[PDB]
Design an enzyme around this catalytic site. Structure first.
Site, PDB file in Angstrom:
ATOM      1  CD  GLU A  35      37.502  45.610  27.182  1.00 34.10           C
ATOM      2  OE1 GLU A  35      37.743  46.725  27.872  1.00 34.10           O
ATOM      3  OE2 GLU A  35      37.557  44.485  27.686  1.00 34.10           O
ATOM      4  CG  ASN A  46      41.113  49.716  36.384  1.00 32.97           C
ATOM      5  OD1 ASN A  46      39.830  49.692  36.391  1.00 32.97           O
ATOM      6  ND2 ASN A  46      42.122  49.335  35.870  1.00 32.97           N
ATOM      7  CG  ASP A  49      43.542  47.030  40.647  1.00 30.15           C
ATOM      8  OD1 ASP A  49      43.180  47.958  40.080  1.00 30.15           O
ATOM      9  OD2 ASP A  49      44.009  45.817  40.209  1.00 30.15           O
ATOM     10  CB  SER A  51      45.802  48.078  37.628  1.00 24.66           C
ATOM     11  OG  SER A  51      44.145  47.877  37.454  1.00 24.66           O
ATOM     12  CG  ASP A  53      41.761  48.665  32.316  1.00 26.62           C
ATOM     13  OD1 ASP A  53      42.524  47.754  32.850  1.00 26.62           O
ATOM     14  OD2 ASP A  53      40.696  49.208  32.591  1.00 26.62           O
ATOM     15  CG  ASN A  60      44.783  45.702  34.986  1.00 27.66           C
ATOM     16  OD1 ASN A  60      45.759  45.286  35.664  1.00 27.66           O
ATOM     17  ND2 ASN A  60      43.978  46.809  34.882  1.00 27.66           N
TER      18      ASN A  60
END
Length: 130
Positions: A35, A46, A49, A51, A53, A60
């Site tokens: 990750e 992102n 959408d 959002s 992380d 998220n």
């Protein structure tokens, strides 16, 4: 902070992650590795959408933490996403535990499915004394 492999495994074990909800420490290590490369300040926007992380587990903002800029988002871990960017990973671990209490468990992270599921993850903790 960028954790060293074994340093992280002991940190996670002390925080109660070894076998949490049936998830071995090696799986969590494989997750943090893929990750973020064990980097607590890692962030990924992102554009699709809107959002982001956050942190070592790349949790998220749509469902887990509040960053105030993600449309219709919720805050299941009841934390500011900023808490997921600290060198101390206690809050990120508390949130990761919350994620896995949901039906999917460790499968909530697609990267886990891609690089850890049905894989030999022993190597992530070998020699770390955990």
């Amino acid at each position: 902070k960028v954790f060293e492999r074994c340093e992280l495994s002991r940190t996670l074990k002390r925080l109660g992650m070894d076998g949490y909800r049936g998830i071995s420490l090696a799986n969590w290590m494989c997750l943090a590795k893929w990750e973020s490369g064990y980097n607590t300040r890692a962030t990924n926007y992102n554009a699709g959408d809107r959002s982001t992380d956050y942190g070592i587990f790349q949790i998220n903002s749509r469902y887990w933490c509040n960053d105030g800029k993600t449309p219709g988002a919720v805050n299941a871990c009841h934390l500011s996403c900023s808490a997921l960017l600290q060198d101390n990973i206690a809050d990120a671990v508390a949130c990761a535990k919350r994620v896995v209490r949901d039906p999917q468990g460790i499968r909530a992270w697609v990267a886990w499915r891609n690089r850890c599921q049905n894989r030999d993850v022993r190597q992530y903790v070998q020699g770390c004394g955990v």
